[PDB]
Write a protein that binds this DNA or RNA. Structure first.
Length: 231
DNA sequence: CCCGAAAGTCCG
DNA sequence: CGGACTTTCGGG
């Protein structure tokens, strides 16, 4: 079965505009986990737009197929493009897609893909269907996969006044002992972000509960100005 | 334009 | 450890 023609067209068009000179530092920035073509976001977005203009966006029946096929290509720009395409199908994504999104999180995993899946796509789903959180979050925390653990921490990132504080702090308590940078930093980020909505609750939490030094320092990067640094 | 964010390197 | 500094990206 041939590659979907839309994916083949995107592959051809991106490859024709590759930049091996830029690809080297781009690959180093992601710790050489991926090959890169060397195409930065503004041009990558335009090249995708070119292909949509010529071919049209595929029928929604092929949405998941297109994403998978791009996910399977070696160069990282294809995963970035896949996420751009998934946004174009946003109004068609619902709670039945949680396993599909899980599988994206745990394949070709790094912060650049996971952070573009979790607080947006998964965040929106669990905001509408909070009763499903307990069908996934406990498994994610218990798993050996750090990207699922990060997903558990960051899916509420943008919730603001809709943050479930008890849940957030429970999740952080489960993961506070992790020695993994991407977990410590995710804890820092979600606390720093939530502190923009409720600084008193974040300050009290970090002063009275154990956290890795990195997590605490990142959490209070801004709000330490509001409370002061005691001698 | 601006700022804040993931990251990243380099240094003490 | 954590501060100083870097580019790239998203949003105001």
């Amino acid at each position: 079965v041939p590659m979907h023609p839309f994916v083949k067209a995107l592959q051809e068009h991106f490859t024709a505009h590759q930049n091996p000179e830029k690809a080297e530092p781009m690959a180093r920035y992601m710790k050489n986990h991926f090959l890169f073509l060397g195409i930065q976001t503004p041009e990558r977005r335009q090249l995708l737009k070119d292909i949509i203009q010529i071919h049209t966006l595929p029928d929604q029946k092929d949405f998941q197929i297109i994403i998978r096929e791009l996910w399977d290509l070696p160069e990282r720009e294809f995963q970035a493009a896949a996420l751009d395409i998934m946004q174009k199908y946003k109004k068609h994504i619902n709670e039945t897609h949680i396993p599909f999104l899980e599988e994206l999180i745990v394949t070709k995993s790094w912060w650049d893909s996971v952070d573009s899946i979790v607080p947006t796509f998964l965040g929106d789903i669990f905001l509408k269907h909070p009763e499903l959180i307990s069908a996934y979050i406990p498994k994610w925390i218990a798993s050996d996969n750090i990207w699922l653990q990060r997903a558990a921490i960051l899916f509420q990132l943008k919730y603001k006044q809709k943050m479930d504080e008890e849940l957030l702090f429970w999740i952080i308590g489960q993961l506070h002992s992790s020695k993994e940078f991407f977990i410590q930093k995710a804890i820092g980020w979600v606390l720093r972000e939530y502190a923009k909505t409720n600084p008193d609750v974040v300050w009290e939490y970090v002063q009275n509960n154990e956290l890795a030094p990195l997590s605490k320092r990142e959490a209070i990067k801004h709000i330490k100005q509001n409370y002061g640094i005691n001698n």
